[model samples]
Target chain A: LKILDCTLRDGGYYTNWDFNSKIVDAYILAMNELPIDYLEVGYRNKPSKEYMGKFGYTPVSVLKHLRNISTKKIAIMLNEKNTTPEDLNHLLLPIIGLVDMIRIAIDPQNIDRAIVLAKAIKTMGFEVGFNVMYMSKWAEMNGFLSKLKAIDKIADLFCMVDSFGGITPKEVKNLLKEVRKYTHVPVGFHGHDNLQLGLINSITAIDDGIDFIDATITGMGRGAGNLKMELLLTYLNKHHGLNVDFNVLGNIITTFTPLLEKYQWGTNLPYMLSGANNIPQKEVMDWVTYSFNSIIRAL
Target chain B: LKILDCTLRDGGYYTNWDFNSKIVDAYILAMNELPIDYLEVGYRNKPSKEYMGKFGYTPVSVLKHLRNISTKKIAIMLNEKNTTPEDLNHLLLPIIGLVDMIRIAIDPQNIDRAIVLAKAIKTMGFEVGFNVMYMSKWAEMNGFLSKLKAIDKIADLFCMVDSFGGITPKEVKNLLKEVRKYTHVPVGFHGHDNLQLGLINSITAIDDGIDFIDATITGMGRGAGNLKMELLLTYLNKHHGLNVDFNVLGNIITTFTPLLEKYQWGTNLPYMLSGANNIPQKEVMDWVTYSFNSIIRAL
Candidate 1:
């Protein structure tokens, strides 16, 4: 099984897809020293309304800098909604030799479009995966399994992304079992910590034969964050015989502690409400982070 | 199949065993309107050097006010240390008619003393339980099963507590299965949220035939807190054929959010480290909360 540390990529939700060069350099250096299987450095995206750092686009120029510093497989994710076929060509065509994997974050509504994109991205000679968000809703939706089966041949891995971080282990087990019955492709899990079950649910997915798992350092991510990469690494090392250095993890966390404090992402009431209701976090994140109360009162 | 809500008792760790009278009253009132099985009001302990609120001792005077407000079973806990046979007698003797249960928190090393005290508490006509702490450590220790079997008849329930919040769901399942092999007594699980697995682990225990599980409102407790009562209630109501009012839980949480923000008792890297190592949380809690960094730095 592969453990993909997506600290920079997921943590971008708080940092606006931007990170200081010093932190990124330290992240690459620490990951290289550790036994982590994959480092999802960040996303590959087009220019946006707000300014994004080097990690936002993850240009070949940026990866080239880390190429000599790290010896691990590197990955980059893409938001499927805004990224079109032309955008994919523009992004993947240039980094064909520089990148190892490209993961598409697909909303349940865009399964078909994502599959076509995944197949096209696969032809470009990169390991491709789909992070299917709002998995619980999809599990209940009609013909979702059939849709997954159709894309099984196109994608190397399909993830049950707990976007709201609301799912239980029992739910995770059942979802994985259902997905396995339909698709032979490797399964992955990406969880948020709103309900504080991120690590356990990921562990449960591993037990149920998930091929990959997504985590972030100190659980840095969008509202409530993702599973902590350090925690997952420690667990795998202790129980599953993966040899990862705790000191390296400690150093990375110590270096990133200030960012974590400033951003303050983890389980909180608003995120918990969003997770429990299976709602998108955009509203809650705005309410908590951007002073929606003041905005509403002013209106 | 019992859901024990220990919001007042476990949450006491953060508030120094103190809770505003209004919150306690509101908690009792809300719990009465729900399908909760037991309400662990607080600890029944001897006086300490520091001042403790009414919940610290849960005296009859304090509980009498709630006797008419709640119909659910009322319970209190005791730490084996500092609490002696005399302490148990003094505490349990008065609340024999007023309280429904008495749970003794036992350190793994003090199992024998806790069992002895539990037997005495049971004879005094209160439902008794032993929350065996450091359960992972004891599971690996020789003769632990035999020790549990020896006290099987003395306590009403034996709870496998993940005191350090270190044990995994797999470990929880194995531990509960092992405990059942020796003792026919109904089993329970109490977990800390250091690794953010409290709810999932508790749910896993339920699958392993655990007779009861402990949770706290909003996951409030000691270092990293406990399984969240609201989350558990929500899960049971949604998937386990239990009827509960989500709106009521929401109101209760809203009333308690201020305390949660002020205390901020939840998972952090240091607590995660202590949990991962299966060590006591004292050092981590001190380093993280009180700025005692040198001890952790020495490592």
Candidate 2:
């Protein structure tokens, strides 16, 4: 199985894509020595009016720095909603060897468009991944499972994304079982800790023969946070014979712990409620006790 | 399936048993309306020099007060190592009608002794429970499974306690399969969130046909905390047709979020490590950023 660490990309939502140099440096160095396979640096996006840090843009210089420091395969993501096929040259042509994979965050309704996007991303000679969201509703979503047949040769990986963080382990196995009927594309699992099922669901993904899994350093993500990189690695090492350099991991946890502490980026009651009910975490983040400081300060 | 919420009992370790009237009143009132079957209030132990608040003592007045407030069956725990058959009259006789069940926390080594204790507790006409700890080690502990046969008539429930919070869902199923061979006692499961497996492990237990489960409001307990009552209720409501009053659950979450925020009693790095390693969470709680304030103040 393969592991992707997306601390900067997904964790960017909480920090507004702003990580200081010290954190990035520490993270890159630690990842070089750790057992993870891909280091998903951040989003490769078109110019925006709103502010985001260097990782949000992932300028050539930033990739150069990451490429220089990180030994692991590099990855970046694009929001499937915002990205178009025509935008690839403007994005991918410039940073060819700088990254190993390009993942598109696809809403289930946008799967057709995502397959089209994946076609363009694959022809450009990069591994293309489909991170399909809203896993709990996938079976009920008309034509969603059958749509996987279209990505056979087009998509390099199928990442089941738990956008709501509500999917249970049994459902995870069932989802993967259904998905395997249409495509043989290597499957990956990305989990959110809404009901605190992230780690177990990820393990279920592996046990059910999925080939890749996604995690963040300390489960840092938008609302309830992603499955923790440390927790996953520790579990894999213990049970699955995945060797890990925990000394490096410990330093990395120490490095971003300040960000974890300062921002307090993890699960809470509202997040759990949102996850269990299949409500959006981003919406719940606004409902209670979140970003009162950020929201008020912005205005 | 039934749920036993030990928020007051297990959560007492962090608070030194000192919950003021407001939280207790909020909890009891909420529990009365909730779908749970039993409310485990606190430990009933011998007098000690060290300070522990009312719940730890659980005096007659405390029982009378809880009886006056709560409609749910009340329960209490006894640490097997500290209590003997001789202490039951001194500890339990006065509170007989006020509480419904008595759970004995037993180490595997003490199972033979615990059965002897259970026999006496059973004669008192109270439902008796065995919360067996160190679940990950149960297979390796010689004769532990066979020893369970001795409690066939004496014990009312067999609760597999993931004291380290490390057992996988697969292991939970496997262990339960092994356990069914030795006894016919209705089984229960208690989980810890060390590896964030609490929710799924409990779900696995239920799926495996265990009749009782344990949880706490917002997953409050010693070390990494227990499976969350709200999350369990939410999942059961969704899948198992267990009806829940979410409005009441929301208020309880609001009431205790202050304590959750104050004590910071959820899982962290060292706690996760201790859990993954099968090292004690009580030990890991001291290794890192815990009780510095509590430890320094006492000295």
Each prediction's total of clashing residue pairs, residues at least 3 apart in sequence or on different chains, is 0, 0
lDDT by residue for model 2 (A81-125), tens: 999989999999878999989988998988888888888889999
TM-score to native of every candidate shown: 0.85, 0.92
CA lDDT of each prediction against the hidden true structure: 0.80, 0.85
TM-score of 1: 0.85
Segments of candidate 2 deviating more than 4 angstroms: A141-143, A284-299, B285-299
lDDT of 1 by residue, A1-299 (tens): 98888888878767677777898899999988777778888888777787777778888888888776788988888889988787777888878767788988888888888888888898889998888888989767888787677876778878889988888777899999889898889899998888777877888889778899988888888778888887787667656767666667778899899997788887665576567667677776666663422322322
Residue-level lDDT tens digits of model 1 in B226-263: 88887776566545767666557767888888998788
**What TM-score would you give candidate 2 relative to the actual structure?**
0.92
- C-alpha-based local distance difference test score of model 1: 0.80
Considering chain A alone, what is the TM-score of candidate 2? Answer: 0.94
Worst 10 residues of 1 chain B by lDDT: B290-299
Q: How accurately is candidate 1 docked according to DockQ? A: 0.24
Local accuracy of candidate 2 as per-residue lDDT tens digits, B100-195: 999999998899999999999998988999999988888988888988898899787899999898888888999888889998998899999888
